Amino acid sequence: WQECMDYAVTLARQAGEVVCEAIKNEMNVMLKSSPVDLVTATDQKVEKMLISSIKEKYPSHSFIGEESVAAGEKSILTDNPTWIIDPIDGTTNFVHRFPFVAVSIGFAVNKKIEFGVVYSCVEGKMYTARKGKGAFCNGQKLQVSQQEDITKSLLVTELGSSRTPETVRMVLSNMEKLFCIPVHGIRSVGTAAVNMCLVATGGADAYYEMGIHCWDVAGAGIIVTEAGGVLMDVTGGPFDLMSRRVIAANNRILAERIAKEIQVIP
Amino acid sequence: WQECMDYAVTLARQAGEVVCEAIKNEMNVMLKSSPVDLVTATDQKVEKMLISSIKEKYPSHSFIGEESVAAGEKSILTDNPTWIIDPIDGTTNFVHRFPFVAVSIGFAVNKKIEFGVVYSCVEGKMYTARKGKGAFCNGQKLQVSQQEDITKSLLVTELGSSRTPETVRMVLSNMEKLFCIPVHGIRSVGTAAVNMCLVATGGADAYYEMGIHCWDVAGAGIIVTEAGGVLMDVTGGPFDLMSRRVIAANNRILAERIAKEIQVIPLQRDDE
Ligand SMILES: [Mn+2]
Ligand SMILES: [Mn+2]
Ligand SMILES: [Mn+2]
Ligand SMILES: [Mn+2]
């Protein structure tokens, strides 16, 4: 499986080079499901540019991609080598030239993630990881922090794209509870994938979010666990790919504490 | 003023070298106000250095400094050449190695800010700005976004260090109001100096916050405005440096809108 990996990292460093060429241009922003749910050409162009080259070398494999699922291809996962893509995680960052934008690839076989690649291109930081072989950014091994005390932890989370009043009120409600535990802080850089990568590094101790997707967590998740962290559902139950709710923490002590605190948005 | 300023930039960079050296290893983390209000030896070390360096060649000047004020000194700004110093902006980021800690320096003469130097050592970025000569990150000139539609806005703010309940309530409230305009989003990187530098580059359209001190915005503020941005009080009034309140927007139109939506949080000023 060590070839699919190196291939993936080349794709990503390439895709990323497009995204970051694009960033500095004027763009047409298109919407999707709401006036805050955005996409641009590059999101689409890059994703097609990804799915082509992979299947043009790996044609047996299935693909789950974010924007392809949008234009009508289907979000179902089998045991077949599936490449799981998010061409630009951080589209609003992208649209705004806010410097956190990531190309995320995840290769799950038998519905289990085998490796992940997350390239943050404004930064020049290539995160990669390989089940049972370690996590790295730019050729430097990562390891999560040690803090087992919630009251001394720095959490990362996102506010969401839902402006559904009830969905918003639980988002902030949960932030309030955790904030008041208290914890040292809550931070957001604009992308589920780079957030999870900051946790893999030890710069933060846990990340939590309800309402994410396959492709959001499919590259960075295995980078967290291989830096020594744990992935969990917001409910204190197990994390599967299709769950839509995650907690990527440094350890189970912290994961379980966050879970105890926050009410699930359905 | 250039003399004083070109000295500042070099001091920022020495301070920066120290902070990003210290961040790699073992730390003494102590409390100021609370369980959450932290400070390290490096914070205090750096302020004393920065001040011992300036008072040397320009002893005629004053200094407001975060940790100086904490050891009993007073944050009354006058017309004297004052240096306004935050030795590490982002001390919690620092404690965690979450990679945004700025060294901020602001120079006031007759109570108007002349120049500012924010250096974010991890990033390798040196934002500067002299009044009238524009703002630069690392040489390259900066310019704020041209956006004037609140509903297409990316905003940055902080949750504050207060866990005083009625305050935290008000904080998340003012957030909800803006989120539900809607705006495209809201980010927090962890330091008011950097959050504002980002507004200055146009990566974000507007930062706001109640609960800051003069040393958080003294240096970053002139970078924003010199980038073409605006500063304002949360009341729509002109920015007061001592008020503990700030909107740094890309333009009056955005700044006035955030101003309209958010409730004013009761805080004691820096001059009381
Ligand atoms: Mn995306
Ligand atoms: Mn995404
Ligand atoms: Mn400070
Ligand atoms: Mn500060």
Coordinates of C-alpha atoms and ligand atoms in Angstrom, one line a residue:
Chain A
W1 CA 0.0 0.0 0.0
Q2 CA 3.1 2.2 0.1
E3 CA 2.8 3.3 -3.5
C4 CA -0.8 4.5 -3.4
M5 CA 0.5 6.7 -0.6
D6 CA 3.4 8.4 -2.3
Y7 CA 1.1 8.8 -5.3
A8 CA -1.5 10.6 -3.1
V9 CA 1.1 12.9 -1.6
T10 CA 2.1 14.0 -5.1
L11 CA -1.4 14.6 -6.2
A12 CA -2.1 16.7 -3.1
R13 CA 1.1 18.8 -3.3
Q14 CA 0.0 19.4 -7.0
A15 CA -3.7 20.1 -6.3
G16 CA -2.6 22.3 -3.5
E17 CA -0.4 24.2 -6.0
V18 CA -3.5 24.9 -8.1
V19 CA -5.6 26.0 -5.1
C20 CA -2.9 28.3 -3.9
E21 CA -2.4 29.8 -7.4
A22 CA -6.1 30.3 -7.4
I23 CA -6.3 31.9 -4.0
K24 CA -4.7 35.1 -5.2
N25 CA -7.1 35.7 -8.1
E26 CA -10.6 37.1 -8.3
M27 CA -13.2 34.3 -8.2
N28 CA -16.9 33.8 -8.9
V29 CA -18.3 32.4 -5.7
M30 CA -21.3 30.2 -6.2
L31 CA -23.7 29.0 -3.5
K32 CA -25.2 25.6 -2.9
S33 CA -27.6 24.9 -0.1
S34 CA -27.5 28.5 1.5
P35 CA -26.1 31.9 1.1
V36 CA -23.2 30.9 3.4
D37 CA -22.8 27.5 1.8
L38 CA -20.2 28.3 -0.9
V39 CA -18.2 26.8 -3.7
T40 CA -16.1 28.1 -6.5
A41 CA -14.7 26.7 -9.8
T42 CA -11.4 25.6 -8.2
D43 CA -13.2 23.4 -5.8
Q44 CA -14.8 21.6 -8.7
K45 CA -11.8 21.8 -11.1
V46 CA -9.4 20.5 -8.4
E47 CA -11.7 17.6 -7.5
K48 CA -12.1 16.5 -11.1
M49 CA -8.3 16.9 -11.5
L50 CA -8.0 14.6 -8.5
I51 CA -10.5 11.9 -9.5
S52 CA -9.1 11.7 -13.0
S53 CA -5.5 11.0 -12.2
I54 CA -6.3 8.5 -9.5
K55 CA -8.7 6.4 -11.6
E56 CA -6.4 6.8 -14.6
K57 CA -3.9 4.8 -12.5
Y58 CA -6.1 2.9 -10.1
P59 CA -9.3 2.3 -12.1
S60 CA -10.6 -0.5 -9.9
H61 CA -11.2 1.9 -7.0
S62 CA -14.3 3.7 -5.9
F63 CA -14.3 7.5 -5.1
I64 CA -16.1 9.5 -2.6
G65 CA -15.7 13.2 -3.3
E66 CA -17.4 16.1 -1.8
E67 CA -18.4 18.1 -4.8
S68 CA -19.1 15.1 -6.9
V69 CA -21.6 13.9 -4.4
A70 CA -23.1 17.4 -4.9
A71 CA -23.5 17.1 -8.6
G72 CA -25.3 13.8 -8.1
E73 CA -22.8 11.0 -7.8
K74 CA -23.5 8.9 -4.7
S75 CA -22.2 8.8 -1.1
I76 CA -22.1 5.1 -0.4
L77 CA -19.0 3.3 1.0
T78 CA -17.9 -0.2 0.4
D79 CA -14.8 -2.4 1.2
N80 CA -13.4 -1.6 -2.3
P81 CA -10.4 0.8 -2.2
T82 CA -12.2 4.1 -1.8
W83 CA -10.4 7.4 -2.2
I84 CA -12.2 10.0 -0.1
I85 CA -11.6 13.6 -1.2
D86 CA -12.3 17.2 -0.1
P87 CA -10.7 19.3 -2.8
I88 CA -10.7 22.5 -0.7
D89 CA -11.6 22.2 2.9
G90 CA -11.9 25.8 3.9
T91 CA -13.7 27.3 1.0
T92 CA -14.7 30.4 2.8
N93 CA -11.1 30.8 4.0
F94 CA -10.3 30.3 0.3
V95 CA -12.8 32.8 -0.9
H96 CA -11.5 35.4 1.7
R97 CA -7.8 34.7 1.4
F98 CA -7.8 33.7 5.0
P99 CA -4.7 31.5 5.1
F100 CA -6.0 28.1 6.1
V101 CA -7.0 25.9 3.2
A102 CA -6.4 22.2 2.8
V103 CA -6.6 19.5 0.3
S104 CA -7.7 16.3 2.1
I105 CA -7.3 12.7 0.8
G106 CA -8.2 9.6 2.7
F107 CA -7.8 6.0 1.5
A108 CA -10.0 3.6 3.2
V109 CA -9.9 -0.1 2.3
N110 CA -12.5 -2.5 3.8
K111 CA -14.2 0.7 5.1
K112 CA -11.1 1.4 7.3
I113 CA -8.7 4.3 6.7
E114 CA -5.3 3.1 5.7
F115 CA -3.6 6.4 5.1
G116 CA -4.5 10.1 5.1
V117 CA -2.9 13.1 3.4
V118 CA -3.7 16.7 4.4
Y119 CA -1.9 19.5 2.5
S120 CA -2.2 23.1 3.9
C121 CA -1.0 25.1 1.0
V122 CA -0.8 28.6 2.2
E123 CA 1.4 27.2 4.9
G124 CA 3.5 24.8 3.0
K125 CA 2.7 22.1 5.5
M126 CA 2.1 18.6 4.2
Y127 CA 0.7 16.3 6.9
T128 CA 0.7 12.6 6.1
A129 CA 0.1 9.3 8.1
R130 CA -0.1 5.5 7.5
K131 CA -2.0 3.1 9.8
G132 CA 0.7 1.8 12.1
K133 CA 3.5 3.8 10.7
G134 CA 3.3 7.2 12.3
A135 CA 2.2 10.8 11.6
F136 CA 4.3 13.6 10.2
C137 CA 4.2 17.2 8.9
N138 CA 6.9 17.9 6.4
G139 CA 9.0 15.0 7.5
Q140 CA 8.8 15.5 11.2
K141 CA 7.1 13.1 13.5
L142 CA 4.0 14.3 15.3
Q143 CA 2.7 13.4 18.8
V144 CA -0.3 14.7 20.6
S145 CA 0.0 16.5 23.9
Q146 CA -0.3 14.9 27.3
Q147 CA -2.8 17.1 29.1
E148 CA -5.4 15.0 31.0
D149 CA -6.9 18.0 32.7
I150 CA -9.8 19.6 30.8
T151 CA -9.3 22.8 32.8
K152 CA -5.9 23.4 31.2
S153 CA -6.8 22.4 27.7
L154 CA -7.1 24.5 24.5
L155 CA -9.9 23.2 22.3
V156 CA -10.6 23.8 18.6
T157 CA -14.0 23.8 17.0
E158 CA -16.1 25.3 14.2
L159 CA -19.3 27.4 14.5
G160 CA -20.9 25.5 11.6
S161 CA -22.6 26.5 8.3
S162 CA -26.1 25.9 9.6
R163 CA -27.9 29.1 10.5
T164 CA -30.9 27.1 11.6
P165 CA -31.8 28.9 14.8
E166 CA -32.1 25.8 16.9
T167 CA -28.9 24.4 15.4
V168 CA -27.1 27.6 16.2
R169 CA -28.3 27.9 19.7
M170 CA -27.0 24.4 20.6
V171 CA -23.7 25.2 19.0
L172 CA -23.1 28.2 21.2
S173 CA -24.8 26.6 24.2
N174 CA -22.2 23.8 24.0
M175 CA -19.4 26.3 23.6
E176 CA -20.6 28.1 26.7
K177 CA -20.6 24.9 28.8
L178 CA -17.1 23.9 27.8
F179 CA -15.8 27.5 28.0
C180 CA -17.1 27.8 31.6
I181 CA -15.8 24.4 32.8
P182 CA -13.4 26.3 32.3
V183 CA -10.9 25.5 29.7
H184 CA -7.9 27.7 28.6
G185 CA -9.6 28.6 25.4
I186 CA -11.5 27.7 22.3
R187 CA -10.0 28.4 18.8
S188 CA -11.2 28.1 15.1
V189 CA -9.1 28.4 12.0
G190 CA -11.9 27.7 9.5
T191 CA -11.4 24.1 8.4
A192 CA -12.1 20.7 10.2
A193 CA -9.1 19.2 8.6
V194 CA -6.5 21.7 9.6
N195 CA -8.0 21.9 13.1
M196 CA -7.6 18.1 13.5
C197 CA -4.0 18.5 12.3
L198 CA -3.2 21.1 15.0
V199 CA -4.4 18.5 17.5
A200 CA -2.2 15.9 16.0
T201 CA 0.7 18.3 16.5
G202 CA 0.0 19.1 20.2
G203 CA -0.9 22.7 19.6
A204 CA -4.4 21.9 20.8
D205 CA -5.8 19.1 22.9
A206 CA -9.1 18.2 21.4
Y207 CA -11.3 19.2 18.4
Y208 CA -15.1 18.6 18.4
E209 CA -17.8 19.2 15.8
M210 CA -21.3 18.0 15.0
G211 CA -22.5 17.9 11.4
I212 CA -19.3 17.1 9.4
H213 CA -18.8 14.6 6.5
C214 CA -16.9 11.6 5.3
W215 CA -14.4 13.8 3.5
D216 CA -13.9 16.3 6.3
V217 CA -12.4 13.7 8.7
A218 CA -11.0 11.1 6.4
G219 CA -7.5 12.5 5.9
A220 CA -6.8 14.2 9.2
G221 CA -8.4 11.6 11.4
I222 CA -5.7 9.0 10.9
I223 CA -3.1 11.7 11.4
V224 CA -4.6 12.3 14.9
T225 CA -4.7 8.7 16.0
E226 CA -1.2 8.0 14.7
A227 CA 0.1 11.1 16.6
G228 CA -1.2 9.1 19.5
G229 CA -4.7 10.7 19.8
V230 CA -8.2 9.2 19.8
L231 CA -11.2 9.7 17.6
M232 CA -14.6 9.4 19.2
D233 CA -18.2 10.3 18.5
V234 CA -19.7 13.2 20.3
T235 CA -21.8 10.7 22.2
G236 CA -18.9 9.0 23.9
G237 CA -19.5 6.1 21.5
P238 CA -17.3 4.8 18.7
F239 CA -16.3 6.8 15.6
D240 CA -17.3 5.5 12.2
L241 CA -16.7 7.3 8.9
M242 CA -20.4 8.0 8.3
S243 CA -21.1 9.4 11.7
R244 CA -21.3 13.2 10.9
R245 CA -20.2 14.0 14.5
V246 CA -16.6 13.7 15.8
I247 CA -14.3 14.4 18.7
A248 CA -10.5 14.1 17.9
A249 CA -8.8 14.4 21.3
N250 CA -5.3 13.9 22.7
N251 CA -6.7 11.1 25.0
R252 CA -9.9 9.3 26.1
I253 CA -9.8 11.2 29.4
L254 CA -10.4 14.5 27.7
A255 CA -12.7 13.0 24.9
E256 CA -15.0 11.6 27.6
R257 CA -15.1 14.9 29.5
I258 CA -16.1 16.9 26.4
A259 CA -18.8 14.3 25.6
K260 CA -20.2 14.6 29.2
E261 CA -20.6 18.3 28.7
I262 CA -22.1 18.8 25.2
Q263 CA -25.6 18.1 24.1
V264 CA -26.0 16.3 20.7
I265 CA -27.6 18.4 18.0
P266 CA -29.7 16.0 15.9
Chain B
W1 CA 10.5 59.0 14.7
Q2 CA 12.1 56.8 12.1
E3 CA 15.1 56.3 14.4
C4 CA 12.8 55.3 17.3
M5 CA 10.9 53.1 14.8
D6 CA 13.7 51.3 13.1
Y7 CA 15.0 50.6 16.6
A8 CA 11.6 49.1 17.5
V9 CA 11.6 46.7 14.6
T10 CA 14.9 45.3 15.6
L11 CA 13.8 44.9 19.2
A12 CA 10.6 43.2 18.1
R13 CA 12.8 40.7 16.3
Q14 CA 15.1 40.1 19.3
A15 CA 12.0 39.6 21.5
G16 CA 10.6 37.3 18.9
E17 CA 13.7 35.2 18.8
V18 CA 13.5 34.8 22.5
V19 CA 9.8 33.8 22.6
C20 CA 10.0 31.2 19.8
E21 CA 13.1 29.8 21.5
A22 CA 11.2 29.5 24.8
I23 CA 8.2 27.9 23.2
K24 CA 10.1 24.8 22.2
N25 CA 10.8 23.8 25.8
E26 CA 9.8 23.7 29.5
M27 CA 7.7 26.4 30.9
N28 CA 6.8 28.0 34.2
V29 CA 3.1 28.8 33.9
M30 CA 1.7 31.0 36.7
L31 CA -1.6 32.8 37.3
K32 CA -2.4 36.4 37.2
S33 CA -6.2 37.1 37.8
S34 CA -7.5 33.6 37.7
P35 CA -7.2 29.9 36.7
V36 CA -7.3 31.1 33.1
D37 CA -5.4 34.3 33.2
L38 CA -1.8 33.0 32.6
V39 CA 1.7 34.3 32.4
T40 CA 5.2 32.7 32.0
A41 CA 8.7 33.8 32.9
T42 CA 9.2 34.6 29.2
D43 CA 6.4 37.2 29.3
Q44 CA 8.1 39.1 32.1
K45 CA 11.7 38.5 30.9
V46 CA 10.8 40.0 27.5
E47 CA 9.0 43.0 28.8
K48 CA 11.9 43.9 31.1
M49 CA 14.4 43.5 28.2
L50 CA 12.3 45.5 25.8
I51 CA 12.0 48.3 28.4
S52 CA 15.6 48.1 29.6
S53 CA 16.6 48.5 25.9
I54 CA 14.5 51.6 25.2
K55 CA 14.8 53.4 28.5
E56 CA 18.5 53.1 27.8
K57 CA 18.7 55.1 24.6
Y58 CA 15.6 57.1 25.2
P59 CA 15.1 57.4 29.0
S60 CA 13.1 60.6 28.3
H61 CA 10.2 58.3 27.3
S62 CA 7.4 56.6 29.2
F63 CA 6.4 52.9 29.0
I64 CA 3.0 51.3 29.5
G65 CA 3.6 47.6 29.6
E66 CA 1.2 44.7 30.4
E67 CA 3.3 43.0 33.1
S68 CA 4.7 46.3 34.4
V69 CA 1.1 47.4 35.1
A70 CA 0.6 44.1 36.9
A71 CA 3.6 44.8 39.2
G72 CA 1.8 47.9 40.3
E73 CA 2.7 50.4 37.6
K74 CA 0.0 52.7 36.1
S75 CA -1.6 52.8 32.6
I76 CA -2.0 56.6 32.3
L77 CA -0.9 57.7 28.9
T78 CA 0.2 61.3 28.5
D79 CA 1.7 63.4 25.7
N80 CA 5.2 62.2 26.5
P81 CA 6.7 59.7 24.0
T82 CA 5.2 56.6 25.5
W83 CA 6.1 53.0 24.5
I84 CA 3.1 50.6 24.8
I85 CA 4.3 47.1 25.0
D86 CA 2.7 43.6 25.1
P87 CA 5.6 41.3 25.5
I88 CA 3.7 38.2 24.4
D89 CA 0.3 38.6 22.9
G90 CA -1.1 35.1 22.9
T91 CA 0.3 33.8 26.2
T92 CA -2.1 30.9 26.2
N93 CA -1.2 29.9 22.6
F94 CA 2.4 30.1 23.9
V95 CA 1.6 27.8 26.8
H96 CA 0.1 25.3 24.4
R97 CA 2.3 25.7 21.4
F98 CA -0.7 26.6 19.3
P99 CA 1.3 28.5 16.8
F100 CA 0.3 32.2 17.0
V101 CA 2.2 34.4 19.5
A102 CA 2.9 38.0 18.7
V103 CA 5.2 40.6 20.2
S104 CA 3.5 44.0 20.0
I105 CA 5.0 47.5 20.3
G106 CA 3.2 50.8 19.9
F107 CA 4.5 54.3 20.1
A108 CA 2.4 57.3 21.2
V109 CA 3.3 60.9 21.0
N110 CA 0.7 63.4 22.1
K111 CA -1.6 60.4 22.6
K112 CA -1.8 59.6 18.9
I113 CA -0.1 56.4 17.7
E114 CA 2.8 57.1 15.4
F115 CA 3.9 53.6 14.6
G116 CA 3.4 50.0 15.5
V117 CA 5.3 46.7 15.2
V118 CA 3.7 43.3 15.5
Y119 CA 6.0 40.4 15.0
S120 CA 4.5 36.9 14.9
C121 CA 7.6 34.8 15.4
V122 CA 6.3 31.3 14.6
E123 CA 4.8 32.6 11.3
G124 CA 8.0 34.5 10.6
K125 CA 5.9 37.5 9.9
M126 CA 6.8 41.1 10.8
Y127 CA 3.9 43.5 10.3
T128 CA 4.8 47.2 10.7
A129 CA 3.2 50.6 10.0
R130 CA 4.3 54.2 10.3
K131 CA 1.5 56.9 10.3
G132 CA 1.4 58.1 6.7
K133 CA 3.8 55.7 5.2
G134 CA 1.6 52.6 5.0
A135 CA 1.7 49.1 6.4
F136 CA 3.9 46.1 5.4
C137 CA 4.2 42.5 6.3
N138 CA 7.9 41.5 5.9
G139 CA 8.4 44.2 3.2
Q140 CA 5.3 43.7 1.1
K141 CA 2.7 46.4 1.3
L142 CA -0.7 45.5 2.8
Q143 CA -4.2 46.6 1.9
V144 CA -7.6 45.8 3.5
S145 CA -10.5 44.0 1.7
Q146 CA -12.8 46.1 -0.4
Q147 CA -15.9 44.1 0.8
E148 CA -18.8 46.3 2.0
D149 CA -21.5 43.7 2.4
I150 CA -21.8 42.5 6.0
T151 CA -23.5 39.3 4.7
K152 CA -20.4 38.4 2.8
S153 CA -18.1 39.1 5.8
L154 CA -15.5 36.9 7.5
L155 CA -15.2 38.3 11.1
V156 CA -12.5 37.6 13.7
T157 CA -13.0 38.0 17.5
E158 CA -12.0 36.4 20.8
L159 CA -14.0 34.8 23.5
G160 CA -12.1 36.8 26.2
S161 CA -10.4 35.7 29.4
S162 CA -13.4 36.4 31.6
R163 CA -15.4 33.5 32.8
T164 CA -17.6 36.0 34.6
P165 CA -21.0 34.5 33.7
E166 CA -23.0 37.6 32.8
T167 CA -20.1 38.6 30.7
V168 CA -19.6 35.3 28.9
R169 CA -23.4 35.3 28.3
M170 CA -23.1 38.7 26.6
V171 CA -20.1 37.5 24.6
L172 CA -21.7 34.5 23.0
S173 CA -24.9 36.6 22.5
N174 CA -23.1 39.3 20.5
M175 CA -21.6 36.5 18.5
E176 CA -24.9 34.8 17.8
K177 CA -26.4 38.1 16.6
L178 CA -23.6 38.6 14.0
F179 CA -23.5 34.9 12.9
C180 CA -27.2 35.0 12.2
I181 CA -27.2 38.1 10.0
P182 CA -25.6 35.8 8.5
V183 CA -21.9 36.4 7.9
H184 CA -19.8 33.9 6.1
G185 CA -18.0 33.0 9.4
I186 CA -16.1 34.0 12.5
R187 CA -12.5 32.9 13.3
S188 CA -10.3 33.1 16.5
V189 CA -6.6 32.5 16.2
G190 CA -5.9 33.5 19.8
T191 CA -4.3 36.9 19.8
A192 CA -5.8 40.4 19.2
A193 CA -2.6 41.7 17.7
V194 CA -2.6 38.9 15.0
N195 CA -6.4 38.9 14.5
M196 CA -6.0 42.6 13.6
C197 CA -2.9 42.1 11.3
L198 CA -5.2 39.6 9.4
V199 CA -7.9 42.3 9.0
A200 CA -5.0 44.4 7.7
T201 CA -4.0 41.9 5.0
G202 CA -7.6 41.5 4.0
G203 CA -7.7 37.9 5.0
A204 CA -10.6 39.0 7.3
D205 CA -13.0 41.9 6.9
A206 CA -13.4 43.0 10.5
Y207 CA -12.2 42.2 13.9
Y208 CA -14.0 43.4 17.1
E209 CA -13.6 42.9 20.8
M210 CA -14.5 44.2 24.3
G211 CA -12.1 43.4 27.1
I212 CA -8.8 44.3 25.4
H213 CA -6.2 46.7 26.8
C214 CA -4.3 49.5 25.1
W215 CA -1.2 47.2 24.7
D216 CA -3.2 44.7 22.6
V217 CA -4.2 47.2 20.0
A218 CA -1.6 49.9 20.3
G219 CA 0.7 48.4 17.7
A220 CA -1.7 46.4 15.5
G221 CA -4.1 49.3 15.2
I222 CA -2.0 51.6 13.0
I223 CA -1.2 48.7 10.8
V224 CA -4.9 48.2 10.1
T225 CA -5.7 51.8 9.4
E226 CA -2.4 52.3 7.4
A227 CA -3.7 49.3 5.4
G228 CA -6.7 51.4 4.6
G229 CA -8.8 50.1 7.4
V230 CA -10.8 51.9 10.1
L231 CA -11.0 51.7 13.9
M232 CA -14.1 52.5 15.8
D233 CA -15.7 52.1 19.3
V234 CA -18.5 49.6 19.7
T235 CA -20.8 52.5 20.1
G236 CA -20.1 54.0 16.7
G237 CA -18.0 56.6 18.5
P238 CA -14.4 57.2 17.6
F239 CA -12.0 54.5 18.9
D240 CA -10.8 55.1 22.4
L241 CA -7.4 53.5 23.2
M242 CA -8.2 53.2 26.9
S243 CA -11.8 52.2 26.6
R244 CA -11.2 48.4 26.4
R245 CA -13.3 48.2 23.2
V246 CA -12.5 48.1 19.6
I247 CA -13.8 47.5 16.1
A248 CA -11.0 47.3 13.5
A249 CA -12.8 47.0 10.2
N250 CA -11.8 47.3 6.5
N251 CA -14.3 50.2 6.2
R252 CA -16.7 52.5 8.0
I253 CA -19.7 50.7 6.4
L254 CA -18.8 47.3 8.0
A255 CA -17.6 48.9 11.2
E256 CA -20.8 50.7 11.6
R257 CA -22.9 47.6 11.0
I258 CA -21.2 45.4 13.6
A259 CA -21.4 48.4 15.9
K260 CA -25.2 48.5 15.4
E261 CA -25.8 44.8 16.2
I262 CA -23.7 44.1 19.3
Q263 CA -24.5 45.0 23.0
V264 CA -22.0 46.9 25.0
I265 CA -20.2 44.9 27.7
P266 CA -19.6 46.7 31.0
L267 CA -15.8 47.0 31.6
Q268 CA -13.6 49.2 33.7
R269 CA -11.2 51.3 31.5
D270 CA -7.5 51.4 31.4
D271 CA -7.5 55.0 32.8
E272 CA -9.6 54.3 35.9
Ligands
MN1 MN -14.6 21.4 0.5
MN2 MN -15.1 20.2 4.4
MN3 MN 0.7 39.6 26.9
MN4 MN -2.7 40.9 25.1

